[PDB]
Amino acid sequence: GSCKGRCFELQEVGPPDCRCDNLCKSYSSCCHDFDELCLKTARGWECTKDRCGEVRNEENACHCSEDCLSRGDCCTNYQVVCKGESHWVDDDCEEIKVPECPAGFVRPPLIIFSVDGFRASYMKKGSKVMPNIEKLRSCGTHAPYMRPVYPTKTFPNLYTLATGLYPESHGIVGNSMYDPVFDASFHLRGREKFNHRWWGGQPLWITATKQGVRAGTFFWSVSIPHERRILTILQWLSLPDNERPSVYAFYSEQPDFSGHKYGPFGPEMTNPLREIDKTVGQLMDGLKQLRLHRCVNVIFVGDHGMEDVTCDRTEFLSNYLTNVDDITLVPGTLGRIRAKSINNSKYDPKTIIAALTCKKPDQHFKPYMKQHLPKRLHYANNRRIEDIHLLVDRRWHVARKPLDVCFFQGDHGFDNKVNSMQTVFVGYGPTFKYRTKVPPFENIELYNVMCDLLGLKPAPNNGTHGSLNHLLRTNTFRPTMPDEVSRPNYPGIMYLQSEFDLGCTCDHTKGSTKERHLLYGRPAVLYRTSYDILYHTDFESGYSEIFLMPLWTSYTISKQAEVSSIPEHLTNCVRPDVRVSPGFSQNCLAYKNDKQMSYGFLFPPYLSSSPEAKYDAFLVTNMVPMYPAFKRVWAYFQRVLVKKYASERNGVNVISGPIFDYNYDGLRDTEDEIKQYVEGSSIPVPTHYYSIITSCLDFTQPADKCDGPLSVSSFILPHRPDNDESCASSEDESKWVEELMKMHTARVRDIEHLTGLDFYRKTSRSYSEILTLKTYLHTYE
Ligand SMILES: *[C@@H]1O[C@H](CO)[C@@H](O[C@@H]2O[C@H](CO)[C@@H](O[C@@H]3O[C@H](CO[C@H]4O[C@H](CO[C@H]5O[C@H](CO)[C@@H](O)[C@H](O)[C@@H]5O[C@H]5O[C@H](CO)[C@@H](O)[C@H](O)[C@@H]5O)[C@@H](O)[C@H](O[C@H]5O[C@H](CO)[C@@H](O)[C@H](O)[C@@H]5O[C@H]5O[C@H](CO)[C@@H](O)[C@H](O)[C@@H]5O)[C@@H]4O)[C@@H](O)[C@H](O[C@H]4O[C@H](CO)[C@@H](O)[C@H](O)[C@@H]4O)[C@@H]3O)[C@H](O)[C@H]2NC(C)=O)[C@H](O)[C@H]1NC(C)=O
Ligand SMILES: C[C@H](CCC(=O)NCCS(=O)(=O)O)[C@H]1CC[C@H]2[C@@H]3[C@@H](O)C[C@@H]4C[C@H](O)CC[C@]4(C)[C@H]3CC[C@]12C
Ligand SMILES: [Ca+2]
Ligand code: NA
Ligand code: NA
Ligand SMILES: [Zn+2]
Ligand SMILES: [Zn+2]
């Protein structure tokens, strides 16, 4: 048939009839007259003086006739040129206290305006280059920058924005991927991306449709120019109440292309930024023309930043591996390695990793088995993520061999904490705040916000719902603190010293402990288990009788506190805990028989308040299994760094503990999932150790008497039997441990997922502020 009267229709027609929608050029299914009827270009996209009040001519791309406003198809500048109206950008900021929408609108619409490769620092260029974007920014709600997901590439980030999920969960783990179950590859170029099997989770357009909220088609065939896309959105916004969508999207491919060619700081970046701003200007003028400029919520959001990268900064795997033709490399600003052929039984990942580990002094990438990547990246739990991963230094590439390789000066893809990868967020409209700055946040949080903006219930996702309530004038969501599942026991003196046969040798009480050492209340255990609260002068812990060690150990170290040494006669001291059964305690004979495994302590003897109290630090209930290699890291943290942090931050409260994540899903392991124990024992081996280090944001107040907001940094250290990750680890600990720790920085939330614990349950702060605190990441950038 014809597309007459159905150009860019909001219902995709089945395989009997031809199509007239946004994507009919991509699946080459358009009616023969789609180009003629739906892609008119005559006289361009702007009204001029001589066209004002013209008789309508159906050949024109947009109209300047008296009927155009009623028909909803004026050029965006019609009112400005023909009716003496002002451009939206020339109007003062005026607070939008309530949505001002035409009658019949049931909710404020949401428009998502996405930009590809828009570096946070581009907003520096100001009104001189981007006057419309700068008005949105300063008038609405904005962050200094927004953290994308890893890898910092287009598709993983665009689908993360839409779903609230990590790539490991939504399935778009790269612009390129191989799936070994499908035995097929996915690429930006090609038809494979159109198959539904790749795309998991529930994107916003689906959440909307399932709950009765109609969505505009988010995507366009590339041959449809930007001006037509804006006019079509404006057209859809003029439909009747029963047909009009409530959510829309526009995606710009700029300024990515120019960034790749000229680099992020080229003079050539100005015009692409002007072009995007012009497009924003057309949307805002068009909205104003329709009287929807104080009705619609607009999000201006980037997918990632852009870095200086040239082909002369390329590492080649052929300089490291002898049999480089036996492997397949996903290359560039990250590396992923698998066997070239599945028939090759000789392929060995251990050999590959070893060959790629600390071989050149300036070496500009580092290899990892995926389960050993920093947990903050959340990049492992998907069969499309190859076992071998290369984290590449900012400014560099990795390639397989030299003949694989100047056509570019910019790239992206690196670690999402790198500054050049940070991107933009602006929220403008009745539901966002007025002239408000908010702290940097992660793009995984936006799905929840977009659902709140539309009155939708979010599908289960990786955001923390409530953590961005402070972006909004009005909230449909009020978060609730979860219910504790397991109540603690508080055991007294229940057992004799001589009743222990553990092979170990050595040469209000509640109220005082709790108020000094648990500043923010007891963590809640959100799963079914059996644990005991143990009180001591210097620290408090929740001891698990199932894992035979603390789930958490909590203590406070003032700026005045003194570092002592473990005296030589107590080096091998481990003491039984009379409150805890011998059958629910560790034993020292397990450690003697296990030739690879030693032990450490969660509360450090080095920071004990007296020689008397120090004895509690050696209790069997404060003991945890530690590889000798890891003890170098842990000893340096406890002996040197905790004190240094207390000094710099005016006291710190520390909560430390074990993490078990053998299946690398970022979630607390059950007993069944633990694959390693201290030899011949029931004592499970942690994959990581965490600490959460809290103090007062106002550091002139000490940590234990803080009136206002809190300040937190945390980490999740991998519990490794070597220090191969750290190329400088033969040197003194002062030259490498802290760099290791900063690489493994983490959010409190990451620790909560991995432990099934809920922190900060008793503070003077609102729960919404606390959720914000829990999503914070200290990046060291
Ligand atoms: C980040 O946030 C994520 C989302 O909350 C967390 O990921 C979730 O993790 C849980 C716990 O492991 C996991 O639960 C398992 O689910 C198994 C069933 O798997 C299939 O179905 C689910 C459910 O689909 C529906 O709901 C999801 C939200 O979860 C929604 O996005 C879907 O569109 C769909 O919606 C429809 O239903 C809901 C109601 O149920 C309606 O509300 C809605 O309107 C819709 O009608 C899917 O999510 C699964 O998807 C995975 O697999 C497909 C196919 O391969 C992939 O394409 C997809 O990307 C996704 O892959 C990821 O997860 C799997 C694990 O499922 C990984 O292996 C993979 O590598 C990816 O990471 C499937 O289609 C279920 O069998 C299993 O049950 C068993 O274990 C539990 C105990 O845990 C026991 O209770 C049971 O008795 C069983 O023995 C378990 O329940 C979710 O599947 C998973 N969801 C997603 C989207 O990943 C993630 O943990 C979190 N991360 C962190 C660090 O916090
Ligand atoms: C981003 C992607 C296309 C962008 C692009 O670079 N195109 C290349 C040039 S051209 O061919 O488009 O002209 C969009 C277009 C259609 C979308 C797909 C839809 O059709 C059908 C599916 C809808 C589901 O809710 C999600 C997955 C699903 C498969 C969509 C995934 C995202 C899809 C594939
Ligand atoms: Ca796990
Ligand atoms: Na040992
Ligand atoms: Na090393
Ligand atoms: Zn991009
Ligand atoms: Zn790009």
Residue numbers in the entry: 56 to 460, 468 to 569, 586 to 859
From the reporting publication:
Autotaxin (ATX) is a secreted lysophospholipase D (lysoPLD) that produces the bioactive lipid lysophosphatidic acid (LPA) from extracellular lysophospholipids, predominantly lysophosphatidylcholine (LPC). Crystal structures of ATX89 (ENPP2) revealed a catalytic domain with a bimetallic active site adjacent to a catalytic threonine. Substrate binding takes place in a shallow hydrophilic groove that accommodates nucleotides as well as the glycerol moiety of lysophospholipids, and in a deep hydrophobic pocket binding the lysophospholipid acyl chain. In addition, the catalytic domain together with the first of two somatomedin-β (SMB) domains, form a tunnel adjacent to the active site.
Strikingly, however, the conjugated bile salt tauroursodeoxycholate (TUDCA) inhibited ATX activity with an apparent IC50 of 10 μM. To understand the selectivity of bile salts on ATX activity, we co-crystallized ATX with TUDCA and determined the structure to 2.0 Å resolution. The Νζ of Trp260 now forms a hydrogen bond with the 3-OH group of the A-ring, instead of the 7-OH that has moved away. Given that the tunnel may serve as an LPA exit route9, this observation might provide a mechanism for the inhibitory activity of TUDCA. Unlike the steroid moiety, the acidic tail is not very well resolved in the electron density. Further refinement allowed modelling of three district conformations of the TUDCA acidic tail. The observed multiple conformations of the acidic tail, contrasting with the well-defined binding of the bile salt steroid moiety, agrees well with the structure–activity data, and prompted us to examine further the inhibition mechanism of bile salts towards ATX.
